[PDB]
Structure formats: structure tokens, C-alpha cells
Amino acid sequence: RDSDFPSILRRVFYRPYLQIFGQIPQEDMDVALMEHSNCSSEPGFWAHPPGAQAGTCVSQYANWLVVLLLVIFLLVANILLVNLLIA
Amino acid sequence: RDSDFPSILRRVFYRPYLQIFGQIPQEDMDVALMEHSNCSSEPGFWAHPPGAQAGTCVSQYANWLVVLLLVIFLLVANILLVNLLIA
């Protein structure tokens, strides 16, 4: 719900980039590690990340999909691309 | 003692997978880093992990074996398999 252009760019480029180097902020992405709260009037369920620049609260509709995307991204980036560069 | 199917799957696949990328939650596996407590009526000794999805409390019967398995897993996965893929 931050929806701020610098914040959006941060979460879109900087954080995924840092994940390539072992900086994985599970608390800011996984709903199982956050506190459920009714932050937003919009329908649905929401959770409150503790991170400063992680958004005030994030939707938890399909969070297993976010975790799956994190798994695939870690695989590809950390292992496949880096080893391909080494080769 | 969570013994919940999503939680079991999490601890069986997601956490070991993330350990490949430097996310090693020693506090949730090593009993030396946890607080001893009599959570469960079942006989034995138990400790209380601080993790949210680490189980309410874990047995500490042979925890040196858990640490040894962690050592072997780190070795194999992080070093041997990744370097084999590079080769």
C-alpha cells in the first residue's frame, strides 16, 4: 500500500537484486512470518510487514505463489545464471 | 509439535532449500540456542524455538545428530552439487 514510485522501484529492482547475494527478506514477502491486520479498507486479507521499505501492508491472497516465485528466482539467478557465466 | 501439513511441507522442503542460499536458521534447529521448557506432556526434554514457523517446541533427544546432518547437507548441496553443476 505504499505505492510510491521510489518505493516501487526499490521493491522491483533493488530488493530482488540483493536477493542474488544472500539478502533474502522472508519477513517482507512471506505472509506466514507477518502479523495479520485489517490495514486497508479494500476487500481481502492483509498482513503487516515489519520492514521499513517493505510497504505498510501487503495482500496475502496467493502468497504461496510469491514464495514459489522466490524459489524459482533463487534457483535461476543464483545457480543457473552464475554458473553459466562461469562456464 | 505443530505437526500441520503445510507446516510439515514448509520445514521439509522450503527451509532446507533456502539453506542452500545462506539462510541457515540455527535458532530453529540447534537446541543449544533455544530455551528449555516442558511444553509437551510426552516423555523427554523439549526446547522452544523462537521461529514463527519452526514448530511450537522441538525434541532435543539427539540434537548433535541434527547439527551433523546440517553440516553434511551444507557440504553436499552448497559445495559439491553446485561445483558439479559448474563443471
UniProtKB/Swiss-Prot annotation, chains A, B:
Disulfide bonds: 39-57
Tissue: Widely expressed with a high expression in intestine and prostate. In brain, it is both expressed in whole cerebral arteries and isolated vascular smooth muscle cells. Prominently expressed in Purkinje fibers. Expressed at higher levels in T-helper 2 (Th2) cells as compared to T-helper 1 (Th1) cells. Expressed in keratocytes.
Phenotype upon changing residue 30 to A: Results in a non-functional channel with a dominant negative phenotype
Organism: Homo sapiens (Human)
Residues of the full protein shown: 955 to 1041 of 1214
Transmembrane segments: 66-86
Family assignment from sequence similarity: Belongs to the transient receptor (TC 1.A.4) family. LTrpC subfamily. TRPM4 sub-subfamily.
Motif Selectivity filter, residue range(s) on this chain: 21-23
Assembly with partners or alone: Homotetramer.
Post-translational modification: Phosphorylation by PKC leads to increase the sensitivity to Ca(2+). Sumoylated. Desumoylated by SENP1.
Domain notes from UniProt: TRPM4, is a temperature-sensitive ion channel, it adopts distinct conformations at different temperatures, markedly influencing where and how ligands interact with it. Decavanadate (a positive modulator), ATP (an inhibitor) and Ca(2+) bind to different locations of TRPM4 at physiological temperatures or at lower temperatures.
Protein function: Calcium-activated selective cation channel that mediates membrane depolarization. While it is activated by increase in intracellular Ca(2+), it is impermeable to it. Mediates transport of monovalent cations (Na(+) > K(+) > Cs(+) > Li(+)), leading to depolarize the membrane. It thereby plays a central role in cadiomyocytes, neurons from entorhinal cortex, dorsal root and vomeronasal neurons, endocrine pancreas cells, kidney epithelial cells, cochlea hair cells etc.
Positions on the Extracellular side per record topology: 1-9, 31-65
Glycosylation sites (chain numbering): 38
Name of the protein in its database record: Transient receptor potential cation channel subfamily M member 4
Disease field: Progressive familial heart block 1B: A cardiac bundle branch disorder characterized by progressive alteration of cardiac conduction through the His-Purkinje system, with a pattern of a right bundle-branch block and/or left anterior hemiblock occurring individually or together. It leads to complete atrio-ventricular block causing syncope and sudden death. Erythrokeratodermia variabilis et progressiva 6: A form of erythrokeratodermia variabilis et progressiva, a genodermatosis characterized by the coexistence of two independent skin lesions: transient erythema and hyperkeratosis that is usually localized but occasionally occurs in its generalized form. Clinical presentation varies significantly within a family and from one family to another. Palmoplantar keratoderma is present in around 50% of cases. EKVP6 inheritance is autosomal dominant.
